[PDB]
Amino acid sequence: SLFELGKMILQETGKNPAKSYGVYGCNCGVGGRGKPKDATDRCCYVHKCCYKKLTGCDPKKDRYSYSWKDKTIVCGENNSCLKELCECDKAVAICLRENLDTYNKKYRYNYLKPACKKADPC
Amino acid sequence: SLFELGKMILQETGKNPAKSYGVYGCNCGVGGRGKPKDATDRCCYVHKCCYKKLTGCDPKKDRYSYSWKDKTIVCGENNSCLKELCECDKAVAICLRENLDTYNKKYRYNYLKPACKKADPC
Numbered sequence: 008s009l010f011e012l013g014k015m016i017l018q019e020t021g022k023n024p025a026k027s028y029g030v031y032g033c034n035c036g037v038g039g040r041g042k043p044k045d046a047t048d049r050c051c052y053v054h055k056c057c058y059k060k061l062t063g064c065d066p067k068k069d070r071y072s073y074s075w076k077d078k079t080i081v082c083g084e085n086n087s088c089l090k091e092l093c094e095c096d097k098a099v100a101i102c103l104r105e106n107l108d109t110y111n112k113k114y115r116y117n118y119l120k121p122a123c124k125k126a127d128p129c
Numbered sequence: 130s131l132f133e134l135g136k137m138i139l140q141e142t143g144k145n146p147a148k149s150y151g152v153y154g155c156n157c158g159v160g161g162r163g164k165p166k167d168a169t170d171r172c173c174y175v176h177k178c179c180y181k182k183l184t185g186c187d188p189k190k191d192r193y194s195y196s197w198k199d200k201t202i203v204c205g206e207n208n209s210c211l212k213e214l215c216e217c218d219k220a221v222a223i224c225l226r227e228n229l230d231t232y233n234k235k236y237r238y239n240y241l242k243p244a245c246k247k248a249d250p251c
């Protein structure tokens with residue numbers, strides 16, 4: 008669920024997830040996809056495409072189990088959809104951390120998104 | 130839609146809507162309802178109950194027309210559902226503005242929603 012996702016992002020980046028990625032660029036946050044503004048935005052692009060492949064569980068609402076082991080996100084076995092969901096969230100958390108070096112606050116807020124260029128199909 | 134709602138909140142409060150209310154308390158932004166933490170939170174509680182009365186349109190995606198007349202949100206004549214939807218959004222924007230005096234930053238970027246007490250029926 009959003010709770011686990013946010014927790015992962017905090018654990019990897021050390022940043023408050025809502026504050027930094029709540030509405031970042033054309034792909035981070037509520038709404039759909041759009042042409043990526045930068046590398047960070049592209050992380051969320053991939054993430055939303057990752058969600059599209061899921062069946063059997065709700066990516067926004069459904070809780071799952073994961074652990075923080077030697078500062079690594081380790082997805083619990085859960086079930087098929089929940090584990091795949093967990094791996095989606097782990098991937099974007101890692102991706103966001105790896106692209107902190109080009110994070111730009113000018114993409115942080117907000118109004119942008121409906122005017123974004125339409126995204127390629129996943 | 131989300132765009133009209135966000136614009137209304139900005140117009141009334143003068144505040145960045147996603148920033149101030151994206152994850153505020155148990156009722157503002159993402160997720161469902163919960164036991165409200167304060168007056169601002171109650172606005173969002175009422176808002177989501179307002180959405181339940183809606184029959185035929187999508188509060189998240191369906192756009193509607195409104196205008197800014199004498200610094201007042203004025204819902205334009207669309208179909209019945211879109212009119213009710215517009216009035217739901219107008220009400221919460223006004224309510225959030227009215228309760229800026231007790232807005233508490235501690236409730237802001239603080240995803241506490243899974244810990245919220247179960248909301249009573251609308």
Ligand SMILES: CCCCCC(=O)O
Nearest residue numbers: 146147150157158173
């Ligand atoms: C549009 C972002 C803030 C929404 C707050 C609420 O009406 O739930």
